[PDB]
Amino acid sequence: PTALERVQKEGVLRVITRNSPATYFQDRNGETGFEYELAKRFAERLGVELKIETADNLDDLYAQLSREGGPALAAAGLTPGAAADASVRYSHTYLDVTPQIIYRNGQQRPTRPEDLVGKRIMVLKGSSHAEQLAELKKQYPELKYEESDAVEVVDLLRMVDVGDIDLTLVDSNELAMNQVYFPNVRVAFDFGEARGLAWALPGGDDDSLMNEVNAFLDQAKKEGLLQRLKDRYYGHVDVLGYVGAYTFAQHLQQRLPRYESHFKQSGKQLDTDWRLLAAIGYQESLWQPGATSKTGVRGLMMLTNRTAQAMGVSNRLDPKQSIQGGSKYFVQIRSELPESIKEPDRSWFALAAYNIGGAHLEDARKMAEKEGLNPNKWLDVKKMLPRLAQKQWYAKTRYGYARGGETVHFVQNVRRYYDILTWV
Numbered sequence: 526p527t528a529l530e531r532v533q534k535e536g537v538l539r540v541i542t543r544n545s546p547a548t549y550f551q552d553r554n555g556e557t558g559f560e561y562e563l564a565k566r567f568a569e570r571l572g573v574e575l576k577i578e579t580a581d582n583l584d585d586l587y588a589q590l591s592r593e594g595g596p597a598l599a600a601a602g603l604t605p606g607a608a609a610d611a612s613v614r615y616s617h618t619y620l621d622v623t624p625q626i627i628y629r630n631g632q633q634r635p636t637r638p639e640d641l642v643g644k645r646i647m648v649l650k651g652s653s654h655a656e657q658l659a660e661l662k663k664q665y666p667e668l669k670y671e672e673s674d675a676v677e678v679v680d681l682l683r684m685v686d687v688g689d690i691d692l693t694l695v696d697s698n699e700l701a702m703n704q705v706y707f708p709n710v711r712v713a714f715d716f717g718e719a720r721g722l723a724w725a726l727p728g729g730d731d732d733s734l735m736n737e738v739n740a741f742l743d744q745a746k747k748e749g750l751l752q753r754l755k756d757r758y759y760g761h762v763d764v765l766g767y768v769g770a771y772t773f774a775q776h777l778q779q780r781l782p783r784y785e786s787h788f789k790q791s792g793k794q795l796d797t798d799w800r801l802l803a804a805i806g807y808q809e810s811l812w813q814p815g816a817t818s819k820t821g822v823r824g825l826m827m828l829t830n831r832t833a834q835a836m837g838v839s840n841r842l843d844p845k846q847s848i849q850g851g852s853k854y855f856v857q858i859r860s861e862l863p864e865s866i867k868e869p870d871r872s873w874f875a876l877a878a879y880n881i882g883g884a885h886l887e888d889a890r891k892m893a894e895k896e897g898l899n900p901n902k903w904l905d906v907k908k909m910l911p912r913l914a915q916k917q918w919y920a921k922t923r924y925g926y927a928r929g930g931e932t933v934h935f936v937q938n939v940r941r942y943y944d945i946l947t948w949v
């Protein structure tokens with residue numbers, strides 16, 4: 526029985542991974558993870574049900590591959606081994622990340638390897654990162670670093686954030702993922718080039734499944750799948766901008782505790798994820814109860830006087846009352862959408878009418894229909910929204926011009942902060 530036959534006959538792809546939202550994570554709206562979503566599509570490619578396990582550190586993640594009847598593979602942001610170990614093989618690389626030395630902003634800035642001398646440095650035991658340090662320890666015998674079997678990447682970055690350690694080494698993708706929680710963490714320099722992540726399979730000369738893993742990854746590159754997962758999980762800095770990423774991290778820690786309770790009480794009955802609600806909060810005013818603009822909206826959820834009036838808001842500037850009116854208002858809109866629009870697409874169309882309004886959203890829906898697209902599918906109608914700002918297109922709508930691009934930004938961002946709060 527080949528490695529490939531066995532999975533096909535067992536009806537199940539056994540995959541091992543780390544506990545982390547980079548890799549695999551369990552929440553209310555189901556499971557998520559770069560690696561999970563990817564290995565999930567691989568089990569789908571083969572006709573099989575995926576089953577996820579977790580190791581407690583990386584020596585034990587690699588161990589399980591040697592166990593009898595253990596995991597088919599490890600999908601875990603692993604980057605291949607620089608030396609020779611017969612007990613493990615690696616797929617083609619599926620993502621270019623750069624190891625980077627991480628420091629606390631405003632502290633002494635290391636700029637070359639020498640500078641890592643005489644610093645408290647922590648790293649994961651069994652990591653490629655650990656191994657890049659040993660190699661430099663040959664060059665620099667005075668180098669000290671701690672190898673830890675207990676902590677994960679998120680813990681290493683926390684430590685640098687608040688100064689229990691000076692430095693760590695981590696791949697740039699997970700740094701960017703984590704930049705929205707640790708406002709003081711910064712990239713000291715690049716300690717190498719964009720070596721790639723690969724999945725690990727037990728050692729051997731059987732390739733039945735390895736060729737398929739490699740065929741799947743080459744297909745995934747062909748269709749943009751890795752690029753899309755990269756943006757969802759690892760593109761916070763890329764998408765939100767550096768300044769947006771760390772300030773968000775500041776606001777998570779300094780502003781959200783003041784309102785979280787209210788976000789949660791509104792969620793409870795409205796059966797609406799409070800974290801979705803807070804995300805609207807964050808996009809609307811960066812969790813600033815007292816915020817006003819020059820365009821007719823005040824408060825935490827940026828309400829008009831007429832909405833505040835209809836939702837029974839006494840004081841648009843009171844955090845609780847703004848959240849309540851603004852949360853009630855999202856659900857009123859969600860509820861007014863045609864019956865034909867289904868979750869989860871429903872919630873995303875509701876985010877968009879929340880920014881642009883029902884009339885205009887209807888026109889982009891109608892526009893999707895005329896173009897042969899599905900007006901009940903969000904990815905379909907999101908392609909039309911921008912067009913509401915285009916001459917040839919708005920002049921054909923009942924309600925004309927609208928800032929559809931702003932509206933697409935509004936939903937992408939809220940969906941990203943939603944992810945972020947889910948990933949805390």
Ligand SMILES: CC(C)C[C@H](N)C(=O)O
Binds near residue numbers: 603604605651652654
């Ligand atoms: C820090 C580790 C969890 C990840 C690293 N790419 C490795 O393969 O060792």
Ligand SMILES: [Cl-]
Binds near residue numbers: 873907936940
């Ligand atoms: Cl979107």
